[PDB]
Amino acid sequence: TLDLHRIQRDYIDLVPKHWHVISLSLSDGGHDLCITRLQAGQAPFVLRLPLERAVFDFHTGRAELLEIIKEINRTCHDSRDMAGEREKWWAEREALDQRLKELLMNIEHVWLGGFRGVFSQHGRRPELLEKFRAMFEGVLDKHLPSRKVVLDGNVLELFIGLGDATKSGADFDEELTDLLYFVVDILQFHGERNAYDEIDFDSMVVETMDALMAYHAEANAAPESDSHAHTILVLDKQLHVFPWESLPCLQGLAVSRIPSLACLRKLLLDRRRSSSDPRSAGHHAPLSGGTYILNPSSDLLSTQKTFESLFSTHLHSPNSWTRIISRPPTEPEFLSALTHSPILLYFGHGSGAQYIRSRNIRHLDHCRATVLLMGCSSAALTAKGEFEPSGPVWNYMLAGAPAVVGTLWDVTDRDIDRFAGGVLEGWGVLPEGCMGGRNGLSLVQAVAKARDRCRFRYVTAAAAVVYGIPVYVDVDGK
């Protein structure tokens, strides 16, 4: 607890207040998901969730995920082989899409359950919270025996984070039950004893839900301006393989990853300010002077067709971009692009590691480039799904790249191009309407929205992840 506060002072209090940091790790046993929520100017929140509290433990979840991934990977690489047979290939992938969707639903429902609100990006409102506290403590007085121990606000925020309780058809009964057990356990832990069977949980759910409706009614009447809130995940070595960002509760929200708090801190202090406001919190990369590497191995003819004219028209011609098309970049060219281009686009097979050595990405004085690796398994997870210090992405992060977009497993060209085109429009690298005015989402926000563009949200889009901090395109900057 002493150690954690040193972390708050020396790392978290430097993180923009509209951002919060969540670390995910496992207990030594593997039985518990450990969740820490960190935000500048906020008390740290530490959560320890036993996965089996209610046939589906972590080993089982991870095993199912890796098998699905194995089969997905198998489908990309058959693609060509199947010559009639075309119908069967598609049927196989849609079915895997359905399997992965189901797995993520089960993870959110079973593992997180009523604790999903820990991932909530809602704005904290002390005045409304004090009302909820009063009503909820009232609930406690009315329905418990031992009818003294007071709950931290962060615990109450879990209730708030379940979502808008005033939504037509909203049903929080299991979640609320789950959280009430938590409260009884905390009280119990702090010297207020209570037998489970002597509590009318079913009445408490009803009164608490009404209390949440009261909160959100007030919250809805007076909503705060758009925060441009971002979540940054710190993941244990074996948890990178999980597409956390594609869980129902994080779907569409701006979420990136960072290898460590040390990384995070370095990147924040390296931020470039806009040439010219929550947007000023991100790193700003000029549109001018980027590099794109398009179809380096020459066989991605469909991909080249998709982007060549657009990149010529919108990037190379007016914005002084370096163009590399249907030829491999030499390693010095690649390194030079990383040093000098604010944005590097890689549209090729894999991570591009066939074109640039890992050990040479470390020799770089500074990686200026924000790097998009649009290729198979470009996050370079291990066969066992682990994030290792030797992959390209880790190296970019160590060199100081502000962000890196990559994939957790293998993907088809057509569907990843859909995603990529989405990122570029939303990020403001390309004009609105290109794939069918210039937008300006953060890179993290643009990635989250662009998942919508894929035919398969899970088989393709769930693979897409971003390591780093929010990056904004600075159109007139230099």
């Binding site: 058959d78 991605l300 469909s302 090729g348 097979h349 993907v411 088809t412 060209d413 569907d415 990843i416």
Partner: peptide
């Protein structure tokens, strides 16, 4: 589609 082609596997990238």
């Amino acid at each position: 589609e082609v596997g990238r």
